[PDB]
Each structure stands twice: as structure tokens, then as C-alpha cells.
Amino acid sequence: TFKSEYPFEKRKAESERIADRFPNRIPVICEKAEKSDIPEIDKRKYLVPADLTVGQFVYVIRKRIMFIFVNDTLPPTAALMSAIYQEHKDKDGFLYVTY
Amino acid sequence: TFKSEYPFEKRKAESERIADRFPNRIPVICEKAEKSDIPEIDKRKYLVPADLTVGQFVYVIRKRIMLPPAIFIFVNDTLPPTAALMSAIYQEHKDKDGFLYVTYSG
Amino acid sequence: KIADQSVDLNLKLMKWRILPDLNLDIIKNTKVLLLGAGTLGCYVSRALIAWGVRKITFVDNGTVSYSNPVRQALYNFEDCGKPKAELAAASLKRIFPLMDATGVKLSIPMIGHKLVNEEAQHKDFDRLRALIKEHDIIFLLVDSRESRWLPSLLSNIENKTVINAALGFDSYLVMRHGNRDKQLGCYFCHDVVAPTVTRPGVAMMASSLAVELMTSLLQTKYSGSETTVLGDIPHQIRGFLHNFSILKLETPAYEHCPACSPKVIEAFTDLGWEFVKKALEHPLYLEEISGLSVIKQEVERLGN
Amino acid sequence: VDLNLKLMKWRILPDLNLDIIKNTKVLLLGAGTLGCYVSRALIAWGVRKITFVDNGTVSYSNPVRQALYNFEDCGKPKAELAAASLKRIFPLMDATGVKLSIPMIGHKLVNEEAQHKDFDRLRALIKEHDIIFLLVDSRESRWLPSLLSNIENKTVINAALGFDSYLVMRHGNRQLGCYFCHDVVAPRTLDQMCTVTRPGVAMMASSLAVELMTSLLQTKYSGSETTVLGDIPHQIRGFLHNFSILKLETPAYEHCPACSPKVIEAFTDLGWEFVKKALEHPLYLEEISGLSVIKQEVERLG
Ligand SMILES: Nc1ncnc2c1ncn2[C@@H]1O[C@H](COP(=O)(O)OP(=O)(O)OP(=O)(O)O)[C@@H](O)[C@H]1O
Ligand SMILES: Nc1ncnc2c1ncn2[C@@H]1O[C@H](COP(=O)(O)OP(=O)(O)OP(=O)(O)O)[C@@H](O)[C@H]1O
Ligand SMILES: [Mg+2]
Ligand SMILES: [Mg+2]
Ligand SMILES: [Zn+2]
Ligand SMILES: [Zn+2]
């Protein structure tokens, strides 16, 4: 997993570096759940724009691997990534999601 | 409750007697849910005919407590359909003492 | 040529472009009896001809009222005073002139009433049974349950498929009757199993669902599923306008139903009109025959 | 006809406002299967003024599906025929038909002079009515009416059909999403001009669309989204294959090619000059709405 690879001090660091360099972007991290058998994509970290919707984010993942739950909660397709960021951002500053 | 008042030896004895005096009837114990606030029933032991439906058994309870128009019946933590026959539920949710235990709540 | 082809071509396009295994011919050749040419009968008949149904027969004993045209989609303002069944048939032919559209002015005898003319209502009973026997699907589209009983019994006896549509103020029930062959319930099973002016949209919803249930029901059932090429074949559809909801329900036949009880079937088979005339004037005799009498007297002994 | 409605009020729903429904001026964009069944549901609800808009003529296959036309009507223009048909039902109707082509997005202009006049007449018709029903058979015929009705702050009720499903939804006002929000927020037979639908679908969508209007016209119970007639859903999706109805609500999308504030402002400043460019070059619309920037950011992340 991403959290396993990097410690918190490095996670919170680049996150706070993303805010100053790409403030319009939102640092999001995705990885398939253990139960899902779908392909796992080529990338995990994404600097999605704040005005991006979840449904638009589904399109980017389906393109990278031919349902997207977050904390036992599948958000509406119409939800913006910036809105989900204000409520679900981790202590490091990233937005962790799964599918 | 009914099972608290009588021990199993007495319960299974009366139930096996009911099968003699009334072969085509099902012994039903009906009690109010200890949480819900519906008028407590006055009679709790019912000898209903085998072909009686759930909805017909709902009707007799509603009038047994003079409840004006909602009533729900429960058997072993499920809501049986209204079209079900009491014999079919008695065949499946029967207790070892020979009684069918049902509960009603608002 | 373009007369018949236009409607059928539209349906062929639907079949070959979307649902190749759809059976259009079974629908087209289905002979439909519409009991009631009111709001439901008018909308049902329009959906049926759009599906290519060639033979539709209206049964109705009423005349067009001044307020009918605004709700009953086959009648115009100039039609006030005219008998409904023949007019509804003529109105269908104005839409699609190749229709085998027929109207029969006929009173369905109603249970719970003293006979006003034994000879005439006997003749009406014979005509009703003959009409049901010659058709394939029977739509029960009369507003009163006392008018549903005789057609339900005759259609069951004649082994025809019945589709009931009934309206509440903001709700509707569409259901198909069980047949004799694990038998499904009929319109009268529920009220004895569970004893205790409409919004314009209700009839439009009920009519279209009833026809779409029929067309699905006419397709061959997939093995291992209660579905067809057109989808589900539910027993009952209940819809509500106030919350824009729709529920599917299924009910078994009830042994003591005053309509489809095996004893009621047996008594009709034995006596026909002789049994019917007694049931019409004394509905309590029906509950005796079906066994409901013993059930009701038993519900008393349990509740007293 | 009024007596059946009058009984509905005091015998059943005393708080039901019938006058607001009767005096609602209704514009029907489309006199096909939806327009015909919608208008019948409307007059049953007592609506007095109904205007049909259609640029078509009755085809041989129309009468069995379009409940205002008879066999003898084939070849006649639809809009005026539909209005006269309503008067055959209810002679006191204020029913009129207007033969007008709605300019469709994604097409070069065939006759700018005539299509400019049609644009003007469309806007004046939307302006003079209270409720606009969008009952055409294609997405491209929905754009301009959706924009103009939003500019004129009129309530829009959209109905669209698939082979065995339907969509009924009302447009938000300057807020809820519009018809064009979903497809760009969530990037098959529904609203496809080549789709032949199961006959019952148009009947269901039509009645629910009108029942939604009558409820929407009633006052809201405070602390709730309900009226004396029940719910006022944003979207209704019905399916025939499993006899289900699903309700859904979506917010207005910032980069929608129809209701985005930047699209509103481009129209407000440039008018027909913006509309003409949008009709012939829809990508120019996505540039104005900001969808272009979002589309190329989905591209880079992919
Ligand atoms: N026993 C019967 N025999 C034959 N036809 C009947 C019988 N009972 C009812 N009908 C017909 O069934 C139809 C029911 O239609 P519907 O209820 O939609 O409208 P209505 O009752 O005619 O008028 P309204 O809309 O004012 O109720 C009526 O046309 C009526 O004439
Ligand atoms: N751009 C437009 N401007 C004006 N009217 C339109 C436009 N696009 C479609 N219409 C009208 O809207 C209606 C669409 O409804 P519908 O699809 O039920 O009718 P149809 O296309 O004539 O019938 P069918 O689809 O069975 O061939 C048609 O009557 C059509 O004439
Ligand atoms: Mg009636
Ligand atoms: Mg079309
Ligand atoms: Zn029955
Ligand atoms: Zn929009």
C-alpha cells in the first residue's frame, strides 16, 4: 500500500508541497480493494483538479484498467473531489480512495 | 413471559395434549414486544385452525386489544407474509415445547 | 398495404434493431376482451393497438357523459349520449382502420344485488361467457369489485388469462389471475386473506403497465427464471403517485377465496347459471360454499 | 370536467390548489407520443391554455402511438392538428399549435435568416408561458429550449424515452441540475432518435411528468420537500423490464454546456451570435463552459 511504502513525515511533506506548487489540484491516492479482481492501474497518485467530479474520476480509472467506495460510502457521481477532500482528507493531506 | 412462567416439562405436556383434543389446530402463544408500546393483550394462548392465514390472525389480535387503525406480527425475528398459513409457519418456526411463539408490536 | 405495414413496420424495426427474439406475432394475434370502456379501457386499447393487436372487443353498458371525454381517451365532446362500447370500437377504427374492433352493449351481472330480470340477466350471463371463451386475454377494467366476480370466475373456468387493473385516489393495482394447472392468487384472494375520483395520472399508469405486463407474459419464459425476453412477469404491480413508487408482489391462491376456491369452481361446473344466480343474490352463500363461513365464525371464537 | 376535479379537493385534499394548475400556461415542445399523452393528462387536470410546438407532419405510423391523431390526419402538420384535437375533446380549450423548427445543436445552419426568426419565436413562446415541457426525441433539440427557459426563469420538465425505460426530470433555476448536467458529470437507447420504444413507456413518462408538475405547483410543507400531492423529485427513472422506478437528485454542474454560468453570461452578452456559433460548433460551447479544460485534464491524468 501507499501508507506502507512511505512514513507520515514524508507523506505530510509532499502533500504540503502539493498545496504550494499545485494549489488548484487535490492529491488523491487510489488502490483496488483486496476483494476486487479488477486490474490495478499503472498509477496510484493523482493531482486531480478541485472541480473534478467522481463520475469523471471513474472514467480516468476505467481508462487506466479497462464502483468506487470510500470508507464504506460510495459518494454520488455528482460530488466534487474538492468537496470530498474537505471531509475525508487524511492527517497527512492526501485523499485515499478504493474501488 | 409464557416460557418464564412454566417449565418445559409442563409446556411440552400441554402441547402434546392439544394435539389429541384438537388435531387440526396449531397452539400459538402471542405476547407483546417488551419494547413497543401497544396495549398489552389479555389472552396469550390461542388454538387457531391450521388453515388460518397470518392476516386473519392479525385481525383477531387487533380486535383482542381494541386497536384502531398499525399491527405487526413477528415469528423468530422475521415478518411472515400475510398470505402464509399458520400451519406452514408452525411447521417451520415451531418451538421444542410444541408451541408456535409469535410477537406483536406497533 | 401501407395501412397495416405502418404499425407493423414500426414494430419490426423495434424487434430487429433491439430485441430479435421478441415474438410480435403472438401479441398481434392475441384476441383481447376489454371489460369496461372507461378511462382504463380507453388507455389500454390505445397501448394494445400500438403493440399491433388486431382484435379488440369492448364490453360496456354505459353511455358517454359530458365529463367523460376529458379523461376517457376515445371519446370527444360531440359523443355525449352515445353508447360507449360501439363508440369505443368505432373510435379505434378511426385510429387504425384495419382493426377488428367490436363493441358489445352488455351488463355484467353484479354480485350483491337482487335480479331485476332473470331471463335477461341469464342471457347476459351466457353472452359474457361466450365472449370470454372466444377471446385469449381478458382485461378486467370495471371500477367495482361486485362487477369483477363473475368475469373472474368465468375466465378461470374458461382457462383464460385475466389482467386486473384497479384504481385508488393516488394508487393503482395491476395483477394477473392465477390459472389451474402452485397457483397464483386472484383479485379476491387478498381481502379475505387480510381482512380489515382519482388523480388523472393513476389510470394512465395502470393501463400501460397492464398492457406491458401482458406483452411480457405472452413471451416464452426462460428456464430457471420467471423472466422473458421482455423482462419480469410479476403477479401484482402496486404503484403510488404521492411518492412515485412501484412495488411488485406475489400471492398464492387462497383455498377459501369466494372467487377461485376449488369448491366454487366445482359448484359452478355442476350447476352453471343455477349456482351463479344464487351467488349473485346471496353473497353469503358463496362464503359458505368456499369455506370462508367457517373461517369467519372461527375468527369470532378466537376474538371473544 | 371541472366537477371531477372539484370533488378531488374538498372530499379528499382540501389544501389542494386547483386554480394554480388551471391557470398555468403550458408550452409543449414536441407533439409526438409524449406531447399527445401529456396534453391529455393536462386537460384532465383542468389546464386551460396549452400550446403545441412541432415542425413535423403526421406519418402513417403515428396515430396508434400519438393519441391526438387519426388515420385520416396523415400528412397534416402536427402542432395545429393537436390543438384542434384538444378542442374536439374540450371546446373551451385555449389550445393553439405553432409550426416551428427548434434549431438543433451540432448542425450547420441551413437558413440563418429563417432560423434566427425561429430562435426569436421560440424565446417569445417560452417567455409567454409558465411551464415548458421538453418532449422532443433528441438531445440536440433540447439544448436551445433548456437554455432559453433558464434565461427566462421558467420551469422546465424534461421527458425522454428509451426502448423500455424513461426519464422525467425538472430543471433547476438560478440549484438542481439540468438534462445536460448528468452526461458530462458521468462520462443507451434513451433519447436516441432512431429508437422505437415499447408503447407503454410514453404513457408512463407522460403521466408522471404531469403529476410531477401538479405537485410542484403546490406549496411546500415547511421543513420538508413535500406538498399536499406528495414528493417533488428532481429526476424519475422508470424501467419496464423489472417494473421499477428510481428517483434521483443532482446539483447543477459548473461546466455544463447548457446551464453553466459562463454559458448564461455568453448568451446574455452576445445573444444570437453566441447561439449561432454554439449550434454549428458544439466544441466552442465546451470551451465557454470550461468543459474543454476539464476534458484535457481527464486526458492528462489518463
Ligand atoms: N356491470 C357492468 N357491466 C358493463 N359495464 C360496466 C359495468 N360496470 C361498469 N361498467 C363500465 O365500466 C367503465 C368504467 O369506467 P370509468 O370508471 O373509468 O369511468 P365511468 O365510471 O364511466 O365514469 P367516471 O369517470 O365518472 O367514474 C364505465 O364505462 C362503465 O360503463
Ligand atoms: N428540432 C425540432 N423542432 C420542432 N419539433 C421537433 C424537433 N425535433 C422533433 N420534433 C417533433 O417532436 C416530436 C417527437 O416525438 P415522437 O418521436 O413521438 O414523434 P415521431 O418522431 O413523429 O414518431 P416516431 O418516433 O414514432 O417516428 C415529433 O412530433 C417531431 O415532429
Ligand atoms: Mg367509475
Ligand atoms: Mg421520433
Ligand atoms: Zn381467489
Ligand atoms: Zn446543466
Give the 3-state secondary structure of residue B83. coil
Length of chain A in terms of residues written: 99
Give the 3-state secondary structure of residue D247. strand
Give the domain extent around B22. Answer: 1-106
Tell me whether A24 touches chain D (CB under 8 Å).
no
- Nearest residue (CA) to ligand 2, atom 20: D32
The nearest CA of chain A is from the CA of D180 a distance in Å of 13
Q: Which of D230, D217, D129 is nearest to D170 (CA)?
A: D217
Q: Is the CB of C109 under 6 A from ligand 1?
A: no
Give the 3-state secondary structure of residue D11. helix
Tell me whether B55 touches chain C (CB under 8 Å).
yes
Residue D132 CA to residue C278 CA, distance in Å, equals: 57
Q: Which ligand is nearest to the CA of D173?
A: 6
- Choose among A59, A76, A78: nearest Cβ to D298: A59
Tell me whether B28 touches chain C (CB under 8 Å).
no
Contact D13, D36 (CB under 8 A): no
Mutational test site, ligand 2, from D136, D140, D201, max ligand atoms within 8 Å of CB? D136
Chain D residue closest in CA terms to A59? D187
Tell me whether D302 touches chain C (CB under 8 Å).
no
Q: Which of D229, D167, D156, D249 is nearest to D204 (CA)?
A: D167
Buried b / exposed e along B68-102 (16+ C-beta atoms within 10 A): eeeeebebeeeebbbbbbbbebbeeebbebbbbbb
Question: Which of chain C's residues have a Cβ under 8 Å away from the Cβ of B22?
Answer: none
What CATH number corresponds to the domain at position B70?
A: 3.10.20.90
- Choose among B48, B56, B83: nearest Cβ to C195: B56
Experimental technique used to determine this entry: X-ray
Chain C residue closest in CA terms to B83? C193
| Placement of cell 396515430 in the chain | D63
* DSSP strand pairing (C31-35 vs C55-60): parallel
Tell me whether A79 touches chain D (CB under 8 Å).
no
Mutational test site, ligand 2, from D37, D38, D54, D118, max ligand atoms within 8 Å of CB? D54
Q: At a CB cut-off of 8 Å and minimum separation 6, what does C34 contact?
A: C41, C44, C45, C56, C57, C58, C59, C139, C141
Q: Is the CB of D131 under 6 A from ligand 2?
A: no
Q: Is the CB of D147 under 6 A from ligand 2?
A: no
The runs of H, that is alpha helices, within A41-89 are 54-65, 81-88
Q: Is the CB of C251 under 6 A from ligand 1?
A: no
Residue D238 CA to residue C120 CA, distance in Å, equals: 46
Residue A22 CA to residue D191 CA, distance in Å, equals: 40
Mutational test site, ligand 2, from D62, D78, D132, D137, max ligand atoms within 8 Å of CB? D137
Chain C residues whose C-beta is within 8 A of a chain B C-beta are 185, 189-190, 193-196, 251-252, 254-256, 295, 298-299, 302-303
CA of D26 to the centre of ligand 3 (A): 28
Number of domains chain B contains:
1
The runs of H, that is alpha helices, within chain C are 2-18, 24-28, 39-50, 84-95, 118-134, 149-157, 189-193, 201-218, 262-271, 273-281, 283-290, 292-303
Q: Which domains does chain D show, CATH number per domain?
A: 1-302 (3.40.50.720)
Q: Give the Cα-Cα-Cα angle C91, C93, C95 (nearest 5 degrees).
A: 75
Residue D256 a catalytic site member: no
How is residue A70 annotated by DSSP?
S
Neighbouring C-alpha atoms within 13 Å toward the C-beta of B86 = 27
**Residue B21, phi-psi category: left (phi > 0), alpha (psi -120 to 50), beta (remainder):** alpha
Q: What is the 3-state composition of chain B as percent helix, strand, coil, each rounded to the nearest 5?
A: 35, 25, 40
CA D137 vs CA D29, D83, D141, D240: distances in Å: 10, 20, 8, 19
Query: How many pairs of residues across C and D have Cβ atoms under 8 Å apart?
Result: 163
Residue D232 CA to residue D268 CA, distance in Å, equals: 30
